[PDB]
Amino acid sequence: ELLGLGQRRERVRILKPTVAHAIIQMWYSWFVEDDRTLAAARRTSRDDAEK
Amino acid sequence: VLQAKVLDLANHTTSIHIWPWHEASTEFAYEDAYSVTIRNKRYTAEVKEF
Q1: In B, which residues are within 8 Å of A47 by CB distance?
Q2: Contacts 24+ apart (CB under 8 A), A8-17
Q3: CA of B47 vs chain A CAs: smallest distance (Å)
Q4: Where would you find this protein in the cell (chain B)?
Q5: DSSP for A14-39?
């Protein structure tokens, strides 16, 4: 129904969506480090400012 | 804002004499300071009014 008409069934198969997965995760992946790494740096903050 | 004209000095002051004033005046002393520690290193100052 999100798709508009009825009705779900085993059939109707779909060709793949590949490219983007490769891409997506990239976007995705990045952040991850960054917070992380950042967080630590945020921690370690030997001075205030920087943090 | 009912403006706010507030009285002032005697300007033509030339002899004259106040009446309650001392109360009405304050010295500007002041204590306190102004410092920061950055790095780990404290950088430091005061107030030094003049």
Answers
A1: 37-40
A2: none
A3: 23
A4: Virion
A5: ----HHHHHHHHHHHHHHHHHHHHHH
